[PDB]
């Protein structure tokens, strides 16, 4: 859990709450989204 610090069409950064952090980490989670990738059936895979 936390608060959305940065949001983009291909990237999301979450600022983790201090109650869920570890003692020696910056406490940020980065999610990179797959955009317009080929599937096994030659279809489109896209995350928004």
């Amino acid at each position: 859990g936390g608060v959305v610090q940065y949001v983009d069409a291909s990237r999301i950064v979450i600022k983790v709450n201090e109650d869920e952090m570890y003692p020696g980490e910056a406490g940020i989670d980065i999610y990179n989204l797959t955009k317009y990738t080929r599937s096994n059936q030659n279809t489109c895979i896209n995350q928004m």
Partner: protein, 230 residues
């Protein structure tokens, strides 16, 4: 002979996109005929303006993203496809847009033009989510009628296009819904008359009276061939 010809009487204006018109003098049976003909013509052949081309700085194709923009290029093009623009005096104009900072990018941010009016300034185009984010677009608006897919405009071409010019499907018609009703008239001399009420739903950019008169002109121009000797 005893044919009481119709005349435009009243034009209520419910909203910016909703209006009603009335034609009071009608003989028995003419109301439905004219209503159906006018509905078909209004739904089929009205002219309008639509976006046909978009160019964005640092974008090569529609299957891509832009840093600091929450929407994909495809979603931005779809949003631009629903932009209502009224153009007077010319059949082709190029608009420009520039914006910076964090916030939505609405139709009000388009650079002002002398002979171009934006009917709905609150139409959201895209959102910016970074303080250093910026966007710049060159939007081309044309005039036409019907529905012209871009995959058909690519066929009708003899000169190549540079990389970065994004084509958009054009929906020229400004009319969505048409509904008509026939009700009895209030002429005391003849209690066998009826009036035709036509309800229109548009996106602006068109005047109801002008649309009705254009439909009538098209119908008469079509009937000119039947009227003649052959």
């Amino acid at each position: 002979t005893e044919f009481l010809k119709p005349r435009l009487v009243d034009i209520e204006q419910v909203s910016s996109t909703h209006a009603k018109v009335t034609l009071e003098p009608l003989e028995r049976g003419f109301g439905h005929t004219l209503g159906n003909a006018l509905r078909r013509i209004l739904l089929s052949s009205m002219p309008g303006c639509a976006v046909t081309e978009v160019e964005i700085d640092g974008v090569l194709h529609e299957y891509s993203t832009k840093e600091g923009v929450q929407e994909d290029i495809l979603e931005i093009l779809l949003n631009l496809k629903g932009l209502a623009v009224r153009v007077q005096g010319k059949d082709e104009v190029i608009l420009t847009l520039n914006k910076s900072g964090i916030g939505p990018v609405t139709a009000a941010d388009i650079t002002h033009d002398g002979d171009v009016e934006i009917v709905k300034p609150q139409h959201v185009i895209c959102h910016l989510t970074d303080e250093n984010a910026s966007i710049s677009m060159r939007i081309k608006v044309q005039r036409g009628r019907g529905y012209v897919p871009a995959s058909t405009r690519i066929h009708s071409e003899e000169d190549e296009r540079p990389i970065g010019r994004l084509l958009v499907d054009a929906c020229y018609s400004p009319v969505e819904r048409i509904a008509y009703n026939v009700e009895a008239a209030r002429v005391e001399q003849r209690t066998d008359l009826d009036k035709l009420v036509i309800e229109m739903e548009t996106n602006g950019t068109i005047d109801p009276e002008e649309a009705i008169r254009r439909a009538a002109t098209i119908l008469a121009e079509q009937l000119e061939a039947f009227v003649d000797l052959r």
